[PDB]
Design a protein around this ligand. Sequence first.
Ligand code: BMA
Ligand code: BMA
Ligand code: BMA
Ligand code: BMA
Lengths: 108, 108, 108, 108
Amino acid sequence: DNILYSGETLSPGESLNYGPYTFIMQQDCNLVLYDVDKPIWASNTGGLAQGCHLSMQSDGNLVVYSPSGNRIWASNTQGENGNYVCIVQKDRNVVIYGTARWATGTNI
Amino acid sequence: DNILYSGETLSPGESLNYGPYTFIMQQDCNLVLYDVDKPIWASNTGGLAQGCHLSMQSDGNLVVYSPSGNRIWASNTQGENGNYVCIVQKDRNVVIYGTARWATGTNI
Amino acid sequence: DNILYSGETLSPGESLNYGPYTFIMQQDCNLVLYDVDKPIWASNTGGLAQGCHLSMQSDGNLVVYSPSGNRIWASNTQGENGNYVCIVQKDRNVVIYGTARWATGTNI
Amino acid sequence: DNILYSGETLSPGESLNYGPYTFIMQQDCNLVLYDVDKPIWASNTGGLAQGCHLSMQSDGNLVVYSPSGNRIWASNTQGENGNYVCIVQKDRNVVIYGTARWATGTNI
Ligand SMILES: OC[C@H]1O[C@@H](O)[C@@H](O)[C@@H](O)[C@@H]1O
Ligand SMILES: OC[C@H]1O[C@@H](O)[C@@H](O)[C@@H](O)[C@@H]1O
Ligand SMILES: OC[C@H]1O[C@@H](O)[C@@H](O)[C@@H](O)[C@@H]1O
Ligand SMILES: OC[C@H]1O[C@@H](O)[C@@H](O)[C@@H](O)[C@@H]1O
């Protein structure tokens, strides 16, 4: 609910949430962080397309894609292939972390 | 509740939780991942001391310390100084990620 | 979280949250349910005072109080004395339930 | 999550969770509240059947049913037809509340 894992996408209208904080891939292709109803950060890509999705990729890049498979905005954080996370944190920061350094190996 | 940030500690009896998954720093100094009442992973340090704390450090090492400030168990993942997270994931894996590659910079 | 128990208050600026839904006791004494940035319900008491708190009472009434201990808005649901909950639900309804009909009695 | 709404069921192996607290409809038809790995309350119906479901009914009764549609255990809280909730609370109590006294009417 507040974590996007590498290999997952937010569809249009979908969000990560922590308390009053919402990080949403809007239908107007703007990527916005709201504190209640106040925009605090945006990709500033509102109106460049419709029906965009947000991908957290295996190369560590967070990308807004238009439905033509066309890059609209990116974090520009391509690097090592592996596992990454994008988190809406309790401190209201949105952060990409990776690669994975250690695991219990208890996945299902 | 399912994330430990670098610079934070779990005190004795404290846990990270996702649904039926509990990752707990026990009073007997064992670090255990439970699926409901079933231990699925442990540090196997039960009885080596009392009143241990778990630290997620800035160097990326997850360490169980005894109250004498003495290292009892570690992930052995020291590297670059920065920001890391330890997550109890929805897939029941416990994972350390870092360093931070990008942020909105919207922290309070 | 998404539950206010009878005997608790939301202070000014505090909220109940479920995913993109935020139920906030605003600084301007308006009680508002937001879906992301869109107000979908309000007490319509914005500007009648400053520094109001929301109280879920053991008589089952949800009341906005001004700092003079003065009733500004209420659900008008006074009844049996007991335990009640106010919930921001997954279906985006905000509901008062009570009284308590049964419990395990496993409270701390 | 930590709420079961009237009209919903927990299937075998499914749980309500708050932090280290797990309320599970087990495969062995026992209904158990665990604090980490410690059972603190049970229906004591382990082994009376297999593949039971827990149902929070609109008559306010919480019932364990066997797959033959047969009552195995109940809270015995039948009353007014309406909307009820069963909650695993932050205080580690499991409580049934209802009926609904008030709502915003903002459901989807
Ligand atoms: O090695 C760690 C990785 O293991 C995978 O199976 C998943 O659980 C990933 O989320 C995780 O990053
Ligand atoms: O640069 C990213 C870092 O910024 C800090 O202020 C915190 O929000 C950290 O959790 C985060 O890793
Ligand atoms: O008996 C039910 C009541 O028990 C109390 O001690 C608390 O746990 C209340 O939240 C609950 O409604
Ligand atoms: O009127 C109250 C009821 O409204 C219904 O439509 C649902 O949202 C129920 O969960 C709720 O109890």
